[PDB]
């Protein structure tokens, strides 16, 4: 009956810089909840009642909204705030989208490694290609498997760090699943990395044997 | 202080049902409206309902009428859901969250959430296979072919942990979890010392130990 | 005696995905192949793509790369079909085909369809307004069921009585997001002065139950 | 990747008459299946392998046909089979466009009647006009509103029922949507319909107010 829609979906933020997102509603409410979900933990109580900051919450952050349009502030951000967002409030039936506010460092392009099917594992009947991205910033990249220049597509998943403690980067690792008999098919393998850091895409490429 | 205890984490076969706990302490149970959240993994946060522990009294969010049934014990100060007729995309993990008296003060206390997989494999042993590496270079494990969550990996008896990354676990298309362990090393150390992945998975009381060669 | 069960409808918001599910009965679900069938809303039936259960082997019309994944239960003899990023295209009824072996002999089981309508709109009763029968043999008047949310709503006259002359249209998505339908129907002008007539308006989804009498 | 293209798009069979609708790819094929679709029911298995009939399918139906010319026939037509027929085969991905076969009738000439907004939906600032075609047949028609002689354009919505169970005929409703303010600032509220049937186009009328 009240949908809760959040502004932005994600979120960069410098150290110090102010931070500002915001909660629609599609109609109009007395008063908006925040929530903190850190990844790995249970959400908090972060904001209550629009403005009352919950227990341990620190002063620089800042409640505010009426009618339709909330609002969460930061004064000032810090490293310890990189989490997601939620609002909601009784009157709606679910939560808001969220907001992600990461921890905005300088460009790091990725370090990209590949790593053909081992011995042991071709002797079953499965081939898993493995191509790495290394320690990158922003999380915004593409990875293009390349198999005798052959566009591959719905044989690839992909998996994607969380942002680490101590250099806040991405870490992305993308495996090709292949049956044996396709495999030795095929010759050159190769994984096709583009990155707002790279002008130019960087291939990592292997030929059987 | 208030407690909100739920079990850690629970594997369901697809189709059945599953009746998840929430037990509280340090309040009076029946002064507080219980709610149930659902997260399904990578997702945001979904609310299914709210109970009224003195009488009773649910709603439900449209989306749950006949998946989700709350129930309360307050001879025990225990709540509970009970989801059925479960298939893969119930797989979350499912929140128990007090509502504030009065209302408007929000869900203030929250339980850790109960890990709810809904899947058919049985427990078994993950295959481990060497990332041959091939300045500085990456090598690693791939973790393969267990079930269910998680595994851990260690790199050298846990001597080597700057520069590893153990990436989450994607799930495959037959059910079982695929993980992938690397860590970047100089290239000059390749060749000299050894390279000893540590893989140990709980649920079957499997340990696997597998050497990197370039 | 094979069976392919699918729910009747689902309603789900822009943007987000959809799980359709299609439960199979009186076969080895390892034994067939499964495919999957878009009808747009007066259109006509477009092939999605099929899926081996045995393997999970998939084929797709490459129209649905992306927009559509499909998966497989073996322990519950179920197929699943993903349409992620949901947008107005999306709204048709989706049904799952049993593929015969060979394939030559087409596909012999469908499903019931599911009927998936993207929308936004919140759950809500209908306005119920009369159509009454002008001044000037035989005369027609009606009931305007507008204004509603979702799908359906069942009318009847008299409590069930008024039922020779019934036309019930089916009903119209209005630019707001929200259903609209007119119930009429024929009587003679001799009795607009002495038989009453009342339309009897059920939603369900909103435990709305509006009667409604009509007169000149 | 082929495509199927199917001859005609509507057919008007009478009872007991010869039916024949083909369906013609654009490269040749070995086979062709043809299914069948009643309005709100799923499509059902009819004639698979260009020949062979389908359990329950009655002996009136056959198929044939060779490269790019394949065919359905009906010996005899039944009320009961009356639905649309699609052609398919594992070489296309979208179906045949279709063949809505209906029962043909006599003609009838709609009976058309008009509908002022009611004074309760007046009171919430919406007005809606309506002008039913009832039991008429065939099916084409040209519904046209007309305010203060001044022809609407995009601000109506129509619906038509299925052919009828009992007569065969269909029915038609047209909505012209109006704002209250909109309504009070125009005379008099018209739509005008032509079909076969009729001689001269009818046209039904009312002044707001009355």
């Known amino acids: 009956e009240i949908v809760l829609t959040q502004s932005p979906a994600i979120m960069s933020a410098s150290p110090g810089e102010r931070v500002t997102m915001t909660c629609s509603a599609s109609?109009?409410?007395?008063?908006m909840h925040w929530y903190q979900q850190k990844p790995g933990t249970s959400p908090r109580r972060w904001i209550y009642?629009?403005?009352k900051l919950a227990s341990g919450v620190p002063a620089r952050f800042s409640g505010s909204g009426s009618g339709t349009d909330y609002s969460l502030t930061i004064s000032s951000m810090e490293p310890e705030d990189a989490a997601t967002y939620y609002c909601?409030?009784?009157?709606?039936?679910?939560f808001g989208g969220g907001t992600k506010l990461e921890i905005k460092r300088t460009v790091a392009a990725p370090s990209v490694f590949i790593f053909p099917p081992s011995d042991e594992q071709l002797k079953s009947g499965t081939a898993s290609v493995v191509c790495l991205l290394n320690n990158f910033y922003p999380r915004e990249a593409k990875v293009q498997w390349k198999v005798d220049n052959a566009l591959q597509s719905g044989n690839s998943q992909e998996s994607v760090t969380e942002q680490d403690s101590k250099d806040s980067t991405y870490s992305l690792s993308s495996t090709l699943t292949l049956s044996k008999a396709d495999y030795e098919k095929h010759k050159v393998y190769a994984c096709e990395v583009t990155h707002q850091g790279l002008s130019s895409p960087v291939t990592k490429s292997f030929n059987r044997g | 202080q208030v407690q909100l205890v739920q079990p850690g984490a629970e594997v369901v076969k697809p189709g059945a049902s599953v009746k998840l706990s929430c037990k509280t302490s340090?309040?009076?149970?029946?002064?507080?409206?219980m709610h149930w959240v659902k997260q399904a993994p990578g997702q945001g946060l979904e609310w299914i309902g709210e109970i009224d522990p003195s009488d009773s009294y649910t709603n439900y969010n449209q989306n749950f009428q006949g998946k989700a049934k709350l129930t309360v014990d307050k001879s025990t100060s225990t709540a509970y859901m009970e989801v059925s007729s479960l298939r893969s995309d119930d797989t979350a993990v499912y929140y128990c969250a007090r509502g504030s008296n009065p209302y408007y003060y929000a869900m203030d206390y929250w339980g850790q959430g109960t890990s709810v997989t809904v899947s058919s494999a049985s427990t078994k042993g993950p295959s481990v296979f060497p990332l041959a590496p091939s300045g500085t270079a990456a090598l690693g494990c791939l973790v393969k072919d267990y079930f269910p969550e998680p595994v851990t990996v260690s790199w050298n008896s846990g001597a080597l942990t700057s520069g590893v990354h153990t990436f989450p676990a994607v799930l495959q298309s037959s059910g079982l979890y695929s993980l992938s362990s690397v860590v970047t090393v100089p290239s000059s150390s390749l060749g000299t010392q050894t390279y000893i992945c540590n893989v140990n998975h709980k649920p079957s009381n499997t340990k696997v130990d597998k050497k990197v060669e370039p | 005696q094979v069976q392919l069960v699918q729910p009747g409808a689902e309603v789900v918001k822009p943007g987000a995905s959809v799980k359709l599910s299609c439960?199979?009965?009186?076969?080895?679900?390892?034994?067939?192949?499964?495919?999957?069938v878009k009808q747009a809303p007066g259109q006509g039936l477009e092939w999605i793509g099929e899926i081996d259960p045995s393997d999970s082997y998939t084929n797709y019309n490459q129209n649905f790369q992306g927009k559509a994944k499909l998966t497989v239960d073996k322990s519950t003899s179920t197929a699943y079909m993903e349409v992620s990023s949901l947008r107005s295209d999306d709204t048709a009824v989706y049904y799952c085909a049993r593929g015969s072996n060979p394939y030559y002999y087409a596909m012999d089981y469908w499903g019931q369809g599911t009927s998936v309508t993207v929308s936004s709109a919140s759950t809500k009763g209908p306005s119920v307004f009369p159509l009454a029968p002008s001044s000037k043999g035989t005369a027609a008047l009606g009931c305007l069921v507008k204004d509603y949310f979702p799908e359906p709503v069942t009318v009847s006259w008299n409590s069930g009585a008024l039922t020779s002359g019934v036309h019930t249209f089916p009903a119209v998505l209005q630019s707001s997001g929200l259903y609209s339908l007119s119930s009429v129907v024929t009587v003679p002008s001799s009795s607009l002065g002495t038989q009453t007539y009342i339309c009897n308006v059920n939603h369900k989804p909103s435990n709305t139950k509006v009667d409604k009498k009509v007169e000149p | 990747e082929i495509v199927l293209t199917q001859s005609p798009a509507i057919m008007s069979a009478s009872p007991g008459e010869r039916v024949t609708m083909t369906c013609?790819?654009?490269?040749?094929?070995?086979?062709?299946?043809?299914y069948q679709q009643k309005p709100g029911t799923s499509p059902r298995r009819?004639?698979?392998?260009?020949?062979?009939?389908?359990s329950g399918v009655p002996a009136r139906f056959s198929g044939s046909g060779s490269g790019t010319d394949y065919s359905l026939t009906i010996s005899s037509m039944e009320p009961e089979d009356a639905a649309t027929?699609?052609?398919?085969?594992?070489?296309?991905?979208?179906?045949?466009?279709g063949t809505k076969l209906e029962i043909k009738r006599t003609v009838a000439a709609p009976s058309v009647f008009i509908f002022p907004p009611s004074d309760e939906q007046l009171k919430s600032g919406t007005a809606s006009v309506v002008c039913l075609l009832n039991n008429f047949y065939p099916r084409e028609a040209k519904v046209q509103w007309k305010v203060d002689n001044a022809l609407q354009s995009g601000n109506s919505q129509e619906s038509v029922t299925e052919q009828d169970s009992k007569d065969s005929t269909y029915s038609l409703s047209s909505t012209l949507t109006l704002s209250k303010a909109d309504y009070e600032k125009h005379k008099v509220y018209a739509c005008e319909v032509t079909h076969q049937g009729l001689s001269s186009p009818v046209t039904k009328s009312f002044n707001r107010g009355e």
């Open positions: 109609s109009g409410v007395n008063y």
């Open positions: 909601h409030q009784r009157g709606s039936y679910t």
């Open positions: 340090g309040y009076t149970f029946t002064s507080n409206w």
């Open positions: 009642d629009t403005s």
